[PDB]
Design a binder for this molecule. Structure first.
Ligand SMILES: CC(C)CCC[C@@H](C)[C@H]1CC[C@H]2[C@@H]3CC=C4C[C@@H](O)CC[C@]4(C)[C@H]3CC[C@]12C
Ligand SMILES: CC(C)CCC[C@@H](C)[C@H]1CC[C@H]2[C@@H]3CC=C4C[C@@H](O)CC[C@]4(C)[C@H]3CC[C@]12C
Ligand SMILES: CC(C)CCC[C@@H](C)[C@H]1CC[C@H]2[C@@H]3CC=C4C[C@@H](O)CC[C@]4(C)[C@H]3CC[C@]12C
Ligand SMILES: CCCCCCCC/C=C\CCCCCCCC(=O)OC[C@@H](O)CO
Ligand SMILES: CCCCCCCC/C=C\CCCCCCCC(=O)OC[C@@H](O)CO
Ligand SMILES: CCCCCCCC/C=C\CCCCCCCC(=O)OC[C@H](O)CO
Ligand SMILES: CCCCCCCC/C=C\CCCCCCCC(=O)OC[C@H](O)CO
Ligand SMILES: CCCCCCCC/C=C\CCCCCCCC(=O)OC[C@H](O)CO
Ligand SMILES: CCCCCCCC/C=C\CCCCCCCC(=O)OC[C@H](O)CO
Ligand SMILES: CCCCCCCC/C=C\CCCCCCCC(=O)OC[C@H](O)CO
Ligand SMILES: CCCCCCCC/C=C\CCCCCCCC(=O)OC[C@H](O)CO
Ligand SMILES: Nc1nc(NCCc2ccc(O)cc2)nc2nc(-c3ccco3)nn12
Ligand SMILES: CCCCCCCC/C=C\CCCCCCCC(=O)O
Ligand SMILES: CCCCCCCC/C=C\CCCCCCCC(=O)O
Ligand SMILES: CCCCCCCC/C=C\CCCCCCCC(=O)O
Ligand SMILES: CCCCCCCC/C=C\CCCCCCCC(=O)O
Ligand SMILES: CCCCCCCC/C=C\CCCCCCCC(=O)O
Ligand SMILES: CCCCCCCC/C=C\CCCCCCCC(=O)O
Ligand SMILES: CCCCCCCC/C=C\CCCCCCCC(=O)O
Ligand SMILES: CCCCCCCC/C=C\CCCCCCCC(=O)O
Ligand code: NA
Length: 395
């Protein structure tokens, strides 16, 4: 007896098809938006588009393949392997795109002046092509001989009635678990995820150190103004102006930049005017001259400190958005990997039940639906472009 298998299969297939439709629709929308809007055509979003292409291919190809292999149909073993492993190509391509995005944002916050000369569209396109080639080689490695085709399940193959040279096409009968655990999970998934975690950690540390340095230079300017006003001797005035001058040149280092220089030029020239007074022992004139710095601070320096701060806060917010993507990739794929570790490392354990295997498979596929929602909720330029596309070409 036992419940007819087609009842549970019907539920699984219906859910897979629902996921495939949403993965295609949302990720086509991502690609459309980048095509339409020049503000979205930058190197970072070339990797976003490559990631969306991989998720479109989950809906078009990997989900029909997953449905097919759930039936255990008879197949030539290398044809079976291709249908079993193709999803691993798409998932490896996703990992490479996620890693490139993290490195791109790290270069941008670490050496922003070098960024545009280093990271070009032409170089990004070459990197994307190479990553797709490597993804095929990695995900299809079982087809090169690391497979169980040489040790068929003869009982399964006779009970299904397969012909000569065919196997019953079931994932765990043809793909070796040592490949899935040691090669795919540990080396190809978990090591890159840990690398991505460390890169994001370095991004947030760099932003936090730059904001701290901004504030230090700002407090150094103001505190030394108070010292000069509180002073009663040329050397104390002289000392405070010298410290004020270094903070000013440090801040200057940390079209639009023409007004920026004029502000700091008035500032540094005023410090030098006051210093020259100080070296001659004119303390009250040095204090008077040093009081002019306050209108320069209010007219130029505070305004540029604010823009620097808000630019850094935007980069932090944008890096947090992109890291949520990495975290949802991990949440959707880790259950399947962890089940494989139990299967492989605990021969004394009963195998995870079939309903749980298929739930983990469906969860991994749902990852191909979620990124368009994160872009819509977290990134204004995507949200506004989505809204324009839907209102114009669907309404
Ligand atoms: C969408 C288009 C462009 C690409 C799709 C190509 C797919 C559908 C083709 C390419 C290779 C094909 C497989 C190659 C060999 C076999 C072994 C045979 O015993 C069963 C069919 C099977 C498993 C084929 C199924 C269909 C297949 C997966
Ligand atoms: C990243 C987070 C969400 C991972 C979620 C943890 C999941 C994948 C873990 C938690 C408890 C685990 C199960 C607990 C014990 C068993 C019984 C054993 O005979 C087969 C594996 C099986 C069935 C485990 C499968 C994996 C499992 C379900
Ligand atoms: C979450 C990331 C960062 C680390 C990944 C944790 C993985 C590798 C850990 C978490 C829980 C672990 C499992 C917990 C218990 C068992 C049963 C034991 O008889 C064999 C090892 C096995 C099956 C472990 C394998 C490794 C394991 C799956
Ligand atoms: C591309 C669009 C869809 C992908 C289709 C998946 C490929 C489906 C292959 C099914 C098959 O091989 O059946 C023939 C015999 O085994 C019957 O017993
Ligand atoms: C580096 C990556 C590029 C490597 C591409 C080169 C891979 C060539 C492997 C091959 O020819 O496979 C034949 C077998 O499948 C027959 O069973
Ligand atoms: C098979 C399905 C894969 C589908 C792949 C679809 C890839 C589309 C890529 C694309 O349209 O990118 C244009 C980009 O937006 C301009 O800068
Ligand atoms: C089968 C999936 C094949 C996917 C083919 C690779 C698509 C890669 C891609 O679409 O990249 C766009 C590029 O980033 C724009 O500048
Ligand atoms: C396209 C929608 C999904 C169609 C794939 C279902 C399928 O091809 O099933 C073959 C069956 O497993 C052969 O025994
Ligand atoms: C990251 C750390 C994961 C390290 C995972 C290491 C898990 C080792 C499990 C193990 O060694 O299991 C012994 C068992 O007797 C074999 O059949
Ligand atoms: C991280 C999450 C891994 C959570 C894994 C929790 C592992 C619990 C221990 C366990 O599942 O034991 C299996 C039991 O021995 C079967 O017979
Ligand atoms: C998302 C929520 C539920 C999806 C549940 C999907 C998994 C439900 C059980 C599917 C199952 O047991 O599949 C039978 C198997 O396909 C026979 O060949
Ligand atoms: N273990 C596993 N099984 C399957 N499908 C087979 C589910 C199953 C397992 C046992 C059985 O007797 C009948 C069916 N797909 C799978 N995909 C993956 C995978 C992809 C990426 C990481 O793990 N692991 N994986
Ligand atoms: C989407 C709607 C999901 C339907 C929810 C529950 C349906 C019942 C699923 C039972 C499948 C069990 C199959 C099995 O035990 O292997
Ligand atoms: C996730 C689903 C998003 C649905 C938006 C429909 C977009 C229509 C389209 O351009 O294909
Ligand atoms: C199979 C799924 C195919 C996915 C297609 C992805 C669609 C994304 C962008 C389409 C852009 C094609 C160029 C349109 C030309 C029209 C124009 O520019 O006037
Ligand atoms: C597109 C419609 C797909 C219809 C469902 C196909 C699965 C049936 C099957 O497993 O043979
Ligand atoms: C394309 C094939 C990719 C094969 C991957 C092998 C090595 C990765 C590095 C490839 C770099 C070659 C191009 C460098 C260059 O021409 O400047
Ligand atoms: C964007 C461009 C993507 C094109 C990449 C294609 C390159 C494929 C490279 C290596 C794939 C190796 C898989 C081996 C095929 C086995 C065939 C067989 O033995 O039947
Ligand atoms: C990795 C484990 C869990 C990842 C959690 C996904 C991150 C979403 C958090 C949302 C938020 O930060 O507001
Ligand atoms: C998700 C929902 C599916 C849960 C099905 C768990 C009950 C399986 C029936 C059984 O074999 O005892
Ligand atoms: Na993906």
């Amino acid at each position: 007896d036992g419940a007819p298998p087609i009842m549970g299969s019907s539920v699984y297939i219906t859910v897979e098809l629902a996921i495939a439709v949403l993965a295609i629709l949302g990720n086509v929308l991502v690609c459309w938006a980048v095509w339409l809007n020049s503000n979205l055509q930058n190197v970072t979003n070339y990797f976003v588009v490559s990631l969306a292409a991989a998720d479109i291919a989950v809906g078009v190809l990997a989900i029909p393949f997953a449905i097919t292999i759930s039936t255990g149909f008879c197949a030539a073993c290398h044809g079976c392997l291709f249908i079993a492993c193709f999803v691993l190509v798409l998932t490896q391509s996703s990992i490479f795109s996620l890693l490139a995005i993290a490195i791109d944002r790290y270069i941008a916050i670490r050496i922003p002046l070098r960024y545009n000369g280093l990271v070009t569209g032409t170089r990004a396109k070459g990197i994307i092509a190479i990553c797709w080639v490597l993804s095929f080689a990695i995900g299809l490695t079982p087809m090169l001989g690391w497979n169980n085709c040489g040790q068929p399940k003869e009982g399964k193959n006779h009970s299904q009635g397969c012909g000569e040279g065919q196997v019953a096409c079931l994932f765990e009968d043809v793909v070796p678990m040592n490949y899935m655990v040691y090669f795919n999970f540990f080396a190809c998934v978990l090591v890159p995820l840990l690398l991505m975690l460390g890169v994001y950690l370095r991004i947030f540390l760099a932003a936090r150190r730059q904001l701290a340095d901004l504030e230090d230079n700002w407090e150094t300017l103001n505190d030394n103004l108070k010292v000069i006003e509180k002073a009663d001797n040329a050397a104390q005035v002289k000392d405070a102006l010298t410290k004020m001058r270094a903070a000013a040149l440090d801040a200057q280092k940390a079209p639009e930049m023409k007004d920026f220089r004029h502000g700091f030029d008035i500032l540094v020239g005023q410090i030098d005017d006051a210093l020259k007074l100080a070296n001659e022992g004119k303390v009250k004139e040095a204090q008077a001259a040093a009081e002019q710095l306050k209108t320069t601070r209010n007219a130029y320096i505070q305004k540029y400190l604010e823009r620097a701060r808000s630019t850094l806060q935007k980069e932090v917010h944008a890096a947090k958005s992109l890291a949520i993507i990495v975290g949802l990739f991990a949440l959707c794929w880790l259950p399947l990997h962890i089940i494989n570790c139990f299967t492989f490392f605990c021969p004394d354990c009963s195998h995870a039940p079939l309903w749980l295997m298929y739930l983990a498979i469906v969860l991994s596929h749902t990852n191909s639906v979620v990124n368009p929602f994160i872009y819509a909720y977290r990134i204004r330029e995507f949200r506004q472009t989505f809204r324009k596309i839907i209102r114009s070409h669907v309404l």
